[PDB]
Amino acid sequence: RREIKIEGDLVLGGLFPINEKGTGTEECGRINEDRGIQRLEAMLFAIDEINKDDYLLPGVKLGVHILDTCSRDTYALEQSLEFVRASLTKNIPLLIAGVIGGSYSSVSIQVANLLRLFQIPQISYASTSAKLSDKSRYDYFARTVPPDFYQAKAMAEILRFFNWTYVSTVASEGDYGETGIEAFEQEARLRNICIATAEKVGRSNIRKSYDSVIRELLQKPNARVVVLFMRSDDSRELIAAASRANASFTWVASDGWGAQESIIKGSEHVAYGAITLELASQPVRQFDRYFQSLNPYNNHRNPWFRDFWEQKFQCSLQNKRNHRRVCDKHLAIDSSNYEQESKIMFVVNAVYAMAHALHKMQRTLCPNTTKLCDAMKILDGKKLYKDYLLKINFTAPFNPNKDADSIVKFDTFGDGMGRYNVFNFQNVGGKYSYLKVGHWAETLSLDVNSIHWSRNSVPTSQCSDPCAPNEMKNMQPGDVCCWICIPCEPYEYLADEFTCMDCGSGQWPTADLTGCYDLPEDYIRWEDAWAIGPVTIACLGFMCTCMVVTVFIKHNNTPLVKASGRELCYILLFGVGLSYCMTFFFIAKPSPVICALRRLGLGSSFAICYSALLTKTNCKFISPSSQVFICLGLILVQIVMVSVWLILEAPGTRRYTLAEKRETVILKCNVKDSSMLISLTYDVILVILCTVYAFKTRKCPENFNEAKFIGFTMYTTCIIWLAFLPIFYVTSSDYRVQTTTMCISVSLSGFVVLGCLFAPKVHII
Amino acid sequence: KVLTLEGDLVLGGLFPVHQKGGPAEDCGPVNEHRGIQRLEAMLFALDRINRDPHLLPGVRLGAHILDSCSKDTHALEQALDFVRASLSRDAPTAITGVIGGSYSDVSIQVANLLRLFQIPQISYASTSAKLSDKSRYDYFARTVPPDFFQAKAMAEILRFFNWTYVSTVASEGDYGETGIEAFELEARARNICVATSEKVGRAMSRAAFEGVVRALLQKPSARVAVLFTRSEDARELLAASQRLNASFTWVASDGWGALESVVAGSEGAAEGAITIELASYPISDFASYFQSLDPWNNSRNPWFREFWEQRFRCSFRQRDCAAHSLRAVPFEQESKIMFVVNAVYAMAHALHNMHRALCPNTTRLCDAMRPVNGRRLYKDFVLNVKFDAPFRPADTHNEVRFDRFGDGIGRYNIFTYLRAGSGRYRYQKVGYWAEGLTLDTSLIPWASPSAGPLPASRCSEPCLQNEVKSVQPGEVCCWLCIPCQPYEYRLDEFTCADCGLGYWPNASLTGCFELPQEYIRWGDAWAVGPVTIACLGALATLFVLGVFVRHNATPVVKASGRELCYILLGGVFLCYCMTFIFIAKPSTAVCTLRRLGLGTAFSVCYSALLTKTNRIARSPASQVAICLALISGQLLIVVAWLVVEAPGTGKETAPERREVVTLRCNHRDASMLGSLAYNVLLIALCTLYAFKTRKCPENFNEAKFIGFTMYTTCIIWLAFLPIFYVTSSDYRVQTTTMCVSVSLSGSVVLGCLFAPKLHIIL
Numbered sequence A: 001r002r003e004i005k006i007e008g009d010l011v012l013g014g015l016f017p018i019n020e021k022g023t024g025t026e027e028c029g030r031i032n033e034d035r036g037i038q039r040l041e042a043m044l045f046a047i048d049e050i051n052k053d054d055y056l057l058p059g060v061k062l063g064v065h066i067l068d069t070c071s072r073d074t075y076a077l078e079q080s081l082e083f084v085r086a087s088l089t090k091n092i093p094l095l096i097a098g099v100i101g102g103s104y105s106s107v108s109i110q111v112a113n114l115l116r117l118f119q120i121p122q123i124s125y126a127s128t129s130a131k132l133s134d135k136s137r138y139d140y141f142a143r144t145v146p147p148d149f150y151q152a153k154a155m156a157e158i159l160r161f162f163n164w165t166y167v168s169t170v171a172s173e174g175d176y177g178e179t180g181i182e183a184f185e186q187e188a189r190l191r192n193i194c195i196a197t198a199e200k201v202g203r204s205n206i207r208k209s210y211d212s213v214i215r216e217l218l219q220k221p222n223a224r225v226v227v228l229f230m231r232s233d234d235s236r237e238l239i240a241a242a243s244r245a246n247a248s249f250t251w252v253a254s255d256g257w258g259a260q261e262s263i264i265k266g267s268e269h270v271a272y273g274a275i276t277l278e279l280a281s282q283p284v285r286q287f288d289r290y291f292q293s294l295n296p297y298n299n300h301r302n303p304w305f306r307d308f309w310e311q312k313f314q315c316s317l318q319n320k321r322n323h324r325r326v327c328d329k330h331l332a333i334d335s336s337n338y339e340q341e342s343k344i345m346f347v348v349n350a351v352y353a354m355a356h357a358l359h360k361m362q363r364t365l366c367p368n369t370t371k372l373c374d375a376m377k378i379l380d381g382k383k384l385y386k387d388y389l390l391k392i393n394f395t396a397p398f399n400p401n402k403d404a405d406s407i408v409k410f411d412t413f414g415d416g417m418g419r420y421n422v423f424n425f426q427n428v429g430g431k432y433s434y435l436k437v438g439h440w441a442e443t444l445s446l447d448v449n450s451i452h453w454s455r456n457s458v459p460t461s462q463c464s465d466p467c468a469p470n471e472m473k474n475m476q477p478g479d480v481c482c483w484i485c486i487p488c489e490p491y492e493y494l495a496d497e498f499t500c501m502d503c504g505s506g507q508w509p510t511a512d513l514t515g516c517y518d519l520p521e522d523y524i525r526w527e528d529a530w531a532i533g534p535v536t537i538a539c540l541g542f543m544c545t546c547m548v549v550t551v552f553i554k555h556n557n558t559p560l561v562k563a564s565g566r567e568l569c570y571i572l573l574f575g576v577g578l579s580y581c582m583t584f585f586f587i588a589k590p591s592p593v594i595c596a597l598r599r600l601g602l603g604s605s606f607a608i609c610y611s612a613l614l615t616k617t618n619c620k621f622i623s624p625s626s627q628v629f630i631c632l633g634l635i636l637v638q639i640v641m642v643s644v645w646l647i648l649e650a651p652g653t654r655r656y657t658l659a660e661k662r663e664t665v666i667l668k669c670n671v672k673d674s675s676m677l678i679s680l681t682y683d684v685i686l687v688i689l690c691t692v693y694a695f696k697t698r699k700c701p702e703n704f705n706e707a708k709f710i711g712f713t714m715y716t717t718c719i720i721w722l723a724f725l726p727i728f729y730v731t732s733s734d735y736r737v738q739t740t741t742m743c744i745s746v747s748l749s750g751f752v753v754l755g756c757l758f759a760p761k762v763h764i765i
Numbered sequence B: 001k002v003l004t005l006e007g008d009l010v011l012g013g014l015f016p017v018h019q020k021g022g023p024a025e026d027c028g029p030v031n032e033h034r035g036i037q038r039l040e041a042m043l044f045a046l047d048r049i050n051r052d053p054h055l056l057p058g059v060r061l062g063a064h065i066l067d068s069c070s071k072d073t074h075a076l077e078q079a080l081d082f083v084r085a086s087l088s089r090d091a092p093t094a095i096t097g098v099i100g101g102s103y104s105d106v107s108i109q110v111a112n113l114l115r116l117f118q119i120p121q122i123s124y125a126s127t128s129a130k131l132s133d134k135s136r137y138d139y140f141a142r143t144v145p146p147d148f149f150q151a152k153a154m155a156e157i158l159r160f161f162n163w164t165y166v167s168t169v170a171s172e173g174d175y176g177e178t179g180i181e182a183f184e185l186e187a188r189a190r191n192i193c194v195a196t197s198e199k200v201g202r203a204m205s206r207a208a209f210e211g212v213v214r215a216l217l218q219k220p221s222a223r224v225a226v227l228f229t230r231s232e233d234a235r236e237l238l239a240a241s242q243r244l245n246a247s248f249t250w251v252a253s254d255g256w257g258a259l260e261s262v263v264a265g266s267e268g269a270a271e272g273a274i275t276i277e278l279a280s281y282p283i284s285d286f287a288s289y290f291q292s293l294d295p296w297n298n299s300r301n302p303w304f305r306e307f308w309e310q311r312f313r314c315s316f317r318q319r320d321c322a323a324h325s326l327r328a329v330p331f332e333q334e335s336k337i338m339f340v341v342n343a344v345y346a347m348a349h350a351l352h353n354m355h356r357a358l359c360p361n362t363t364r365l366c367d368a369m370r371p372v373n374g375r376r377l378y379k380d381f382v383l384n385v386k387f388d389a390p391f392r393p394a395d396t397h398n399e400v401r402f403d404r405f406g407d408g409i410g411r412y413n414i415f416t417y418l419r420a421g422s423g424r425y426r427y428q429k430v431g432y433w434a435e436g437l438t439l440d441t442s443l444i445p446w447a448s449p450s451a452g453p454l455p456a457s458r459c460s461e462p463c464l465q466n467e468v469k470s471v472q473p474g475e476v477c478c479w480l481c482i483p484c485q486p487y488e489y490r491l492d493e494f495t496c497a498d499c500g501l502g503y504w505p506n507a508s509l510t511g512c513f514e515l516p517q518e519y520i521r522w523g524d525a526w527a528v529g530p531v532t533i534a535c536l537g538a539l540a541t542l543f544v545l546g547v548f549v550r551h552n553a554t555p556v557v558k559a560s561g562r563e564l565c566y567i568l569l570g571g572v573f574l575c576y577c578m579t580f581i582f583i584a585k586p587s588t589a590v591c592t593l594r595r596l597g598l599g600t601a602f603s604v605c606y607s608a609l610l611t612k613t614n615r616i617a618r619s620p621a622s623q624v625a626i627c628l629a630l631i632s633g634q635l636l637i638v639v640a641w642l643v644v645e646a647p648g649t650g651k652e653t654a655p656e657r658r659e660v661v662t663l664r665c666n667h668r669d670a671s672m673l674g675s676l677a678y679n680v681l682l683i684a685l686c687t688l689y690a691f692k693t694r695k696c697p698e699n700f701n702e703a704k705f706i707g708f709t710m711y712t713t714c715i716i717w718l719a720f721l722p723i724f725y726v727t728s729s730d731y732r733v734q735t736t737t738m739c740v741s742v743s744l745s746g747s748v749v750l751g752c753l754f755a756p757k758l759h760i761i762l
């Protein structure tokens, strides 16, 4: 095998993918001209720069022991045993202060697993696996590049910036895509971002699974943003599938897509507002001059350089010199077009970080001299790592390329700080090319002007607009996270932010729709349309009572109708006066006592009617006394019946679901008193009918007019009872008209029964 | 130094032949029990397998055995030799698998190094609990159980004896810490409470052990302690307990075992200690092979010369020893020899299974089997082994098989420290734990009856519903029994909740809703005299009314107060009815009418007495108008009274719970005082008006009696009120007394009013 050994006080290991992965016949293959040779030359250039430097390791000269991994984990594991064979102390071995890690994640994982046992620090330049951040398994591993979940964090931040909550995610098979998609799921659920579909493209499929994935993505039109954390060939396949289909999606991609033109080739219409993340890097201008001035004759340090030269230019060296072509001095890298790899600055940073750690340990442990001393002969990997590698703070070796984030340092897990570039595929004059629109070092710095507002108009990626509970509620029919508005009734309130609750007839929902409040009470008739109605009604009743009292007072001297009828006329006057109080108690505020007084008014009216009927039954003082006792007993029986049906007077709630308004009206007391009122009103009608039949008028105690007056008053009671009988049933509402009609009718009856009785008194006098 | 021998299938080996000697030589003296005996057991097993026509009959097993010097770095360096045989690049020998690792750290390092190169490893003495995860060691197997199976066994032992409150003692290293952690997991999975958790890590003087003993003893409710300690971490603790006179029922682990070096000088403290030890049996064939070993014929082992020199204190240069042998007296078989034999035989069985499955055409190593795939071997033929242990005591329970984690079957022996002998103290196997406990309760000193049982309870027995289960701040897990109030039902474990304002608790004290009923406030035994008095008064009033009606012929009908007499009779009837209804069951409206009825009746009698004042000053209608106005005023004041004192019920005055509610009305007692005060004021005004009368006969036959009786009636009425205040507690006695006084006053008034009629009758 071929190896690179350079003498020096301290030797640093190195592993590069110089040869591609072995085929099915050989263990190795063609030389990887970009990832292996360029990175090896970058390491050699950095080592030479450090060796000829004056302020970094002035007295210690660094050597290297570089090995070829052939892009295989097993080959790298076998080769890395040469690093640990020199630390046993039990082909001269060379001490290895540190090993520069491999490129592929599996290679780095295996190398770290082997090196953690022998306490050998490792710094990688291209490994971006989240598994390598586990310090319980890779406590001696570090890397100058950030892991791959920082890309997921950047995607989540970008989605949150544009207010995109309902997005579709597509990943690939393996471990990179799986880890990235799980990290993105974690970040999205941390930032409250819905995931519409979790599609998978596998590893290698025919152009039908990609079409199925595209159709599945199109099955949810609400999500117009697709999040891609997926490889650099399956991405092209998916783009081709979406080009074959008619779809318009905005892609949020990863470093797999980046700014590469391989994805966009042949399908430059589907991708027009895509967001792609790329690892930020800077070109080391000295490295281009160093590599362009390299020849297969003046560079014998690299054993792989001759084969790389003969493969790149397809010529033959001095081995045959005439096989296919002559590798003359005309062929050179300077004349040919040369592009620096995007991960050269990372290799340079890793080498310089190792050199800085060694310099710090030399200054600390071995002061007073700039030379390798006894105390620094053996290298303590654990102390060196944990004291001088995770605590580095030095600017980029080739920072003259202006940039604020040129500091090279590691976090607690040894990973580098994520500095990503946000790109956008845009148009200028028909030319299709990318354009940087921001960067993600620690926070978003997007230039919205350059993004063209993410294609024509800002795309919408939300599942329905936010829904205000004050007017309508929301539910989740099939989607757990997002919601669809459902109207909420004005008589219901949102107890929770998902469900509307009903106050009921007891209370009304509040304006804020966060609870119930005491609904306005029943309508007050004091300030209603008939505000002066009871006042006018009582005025006539008061005047009639005053006139009756005056007549009774004047009746003491020279009696006219007081001859055995004084008790009857006093009872009639008392009933008429009680009617005035009865008609005024209806408008009183709803109270059990108020409605009890209202019922007592009807009872008093019935007693007055009974007394009026008794007046005709007269045709002495003992017999009038017996009649007074009889009517008093009748009134007592009426009061007993009133108390019988007056038991546990309920408040009498009304305004049920038939009439559900803001204002609910209620009665004075329980609404079960209709039957009691009907029964009580029957007694008055019965006694009026009995008096009408008994009004024979066959005897005149003093004059025939009195019998005629009694008969006329009997007809008025029957007329008012029969006329108001239909109104008893049809008027069954709490409106003002129902009560005012009844009070007016009873007041008119009380006035008409008393007006005719006063006529004989004036005529007699 | 290596004893490797050429073979078709070479098996690696790692034994702690040399004890760790520090930095002086990286390993010191030769380990004569853990490095030599186990290595010779492996060699004997390999020889027997090579001489076995039923296991690998055509292929000969090789050996490549190295020494780890009881250190992890040396073990890694030695395992590098195992690795450097399959690299695609003396003479390396391919290793199909390694049987090595006696220390947990050594085994961990070896497994970490050999995992990357796909080399299966079977251990024989490593019992680390963190070697069971395949995410870090996916090519590691064990013939011994891990260190948490004994924790499960001890948890089951504690559950068997209903020991819920136990003390825990652990060590500072991984052994003891992992054991204690598994112990909390198994205890919380089995509802076992933990009193204390201390550390007795090494390099500590006697003071730390004495403090630990004192801390354990400051808890007389925890008589059982579990010891996750090493030999040196347990001997010191037992010595401290013995010298401090501490008695406990120790439940130890494999760190103690059946060793006699822990009970040396501390027999009293270690009395009745249950100990868990790994179950194993001696191998007679291995012992016989080991006896016939000499430094002259055993040329395979390079460490045998040093072992012979160190053990017998001899030297091969001075010819100090000539005829010596390891007979029964100097030889004691180790407890983990059978585990080494089982590991070697399991590896051989896996190799035989692969040979049969790959190329069954011939019983020889085929070309296809020459490249050995360690991953497939471990996944298929190593983990899936089911064979009887070689050289077994023929018991059916000795079967070798690996679990899904590549661990051994957990089989431990339960030991107790006997004192039931003549004068000798010794151990006894009193059970075993394979998958379930099989204890022999018969002997079980202390921890069984006939010797004094040792219970481990945090506190007293579980409390009944009649007392509050209170959690002690010091001891959280159990609860104490503290009686609560008799009327406070225990809603839950927290405390006794309130049944109600006046509701009696139920029997179960979970749902009571039992409000006592006192509808019959006044008993019928005492409600007889007032009823008879009221009936007599009503009869007298009826007779007086009838006589007055029949007295129309008497001259004194219009001049006299016939209407006044009727009003007085009506007032007497009203007060009698009020007393009768107040001596009955109270109601919401009954209390209001009782006060209104008493006031109206008092107004009626006062108005009747005030009629004499009107006659003293001077039309008959004037007195009627005055009495009607007084009655109307009294009615209005009573109306205002019950408007300000709205009717209600629920007078729960007495909180003694003997009688929470005594019926009555919810109206305040001050309202009753105001009505009585107003009645007394009216009576006093009436008496003053009567005494202010001038000198006039005015029917002196009746006026004198009325004047004499009015003062007495008013005095009785005014003295009835302080009776209630003197008792200072309203009850059925006050109501009956008030009713009796009212009825007596009414009867006296009626009698004095009717006295002229009775006098004129005769």
Ligand SMILES: CC(C)CCC[C@@H](C)[C@H]1CC[C@H]2[C@@H]3CC=C4C[C@@H](O)CC[C@]4(C)[C@H]3CC[C@]12C
Binding pocket: A592, A593, A596, B589, B592, B639, B642, B643, B646, B647
């Ligand atoms: C005799 C004439 C002058 C009428 C006298 C007024 C009487 C009937 C009035 C005055 C005060 C009234 C009481 C006032 C308050 C209440 C509480 C209510 O929840 C039930 C009715 C009840 C208990 C009333 C019953 C009727 C009442 C006692």
Ligand SMILES: CC(C)CCC[C@@H](C)[C@H]1CC[C@H]2[C@@H]3CC=C4C[C@@H](O)CC[C@]4(C)[C@H]3CC[C@]12C
Binding pocket: A596, A643, A646, A647, A648, A649, B574, B588, B589, B600
């Ligand atoms: C003053 C006395 C001598 C004669 C008049 C008695 C009057 C005031 C009494 C007799 C019957 C009584 C009613 C009987 C029952 C009830 C039902 C109760 O839920 C409220 C009070 C109420 C409605 C009472 C109010 C007062 C009442 C109407």
Ligand SMILES: N[C@](CC1c2ccccc2Oc2ccccc21)(C(=O)O)[C@H]1C[C@@H]1C(=O)O
Binding pocket: A035, A103, A104, A105, A106, A126, A127, A128, A129, A175, A176, A177, A230, A231, A232, A255, A256, A343
């Ligand atoms: N950093 C990478 C990232 C890599 C990767 C990147 C894009 C697509 C597929 C893909 O395969 C995986 C799988 C797991 C982890 C990381 C990756 C590495 O190999 O570690 C690779 C850039 C380094 C290099 O080879 O130069």
Ligand SMILES: N[C@](CC1c2ccccc2Oc2ccccc21)(C(=O)O)[C@H]1C[C@@H]1C(=O)O
Binding pocket: B034, B102, B103, B104, B125, B126, B127, B128, B129, B147, B174, B175, B229, B230, B231, B254, B255
């Ligand atoms: N089986 C043991 C168990 C061992 C152990 C046993 C009792 C007390 C202390 C103690 O130290 C630890 C620490 C961690 C793990 C296991 C142990 C091993 O070395 O793994 C040890 C008997 C094996 C041998 O060396 O022969």
Ligand SMILES: *[C@@H]1O[C@H](CO)[C@@H](O)[C@H](O)[C@H]1NC(C)=O
Binding pocket: A161, A162, A163
């Ligand atoms: C996202 O919404 C916020 C309000 O929640 C708004 O201030 C912000 O400008 C929005 N971002 C856009 C429209 O890019």
Ligand SMILES: *[C@@H]1O[C@H](CO)[C@@H](O)[C@H](O)[C@H]1NC(C)=O
Binding pocket: B160, B161, B162
């Ligand atoms: C433990 O309690 C059970 C009942 O739960 C009982 O049957 C058993 O005998 C007890 N064990 C003892 C006292 O050793």
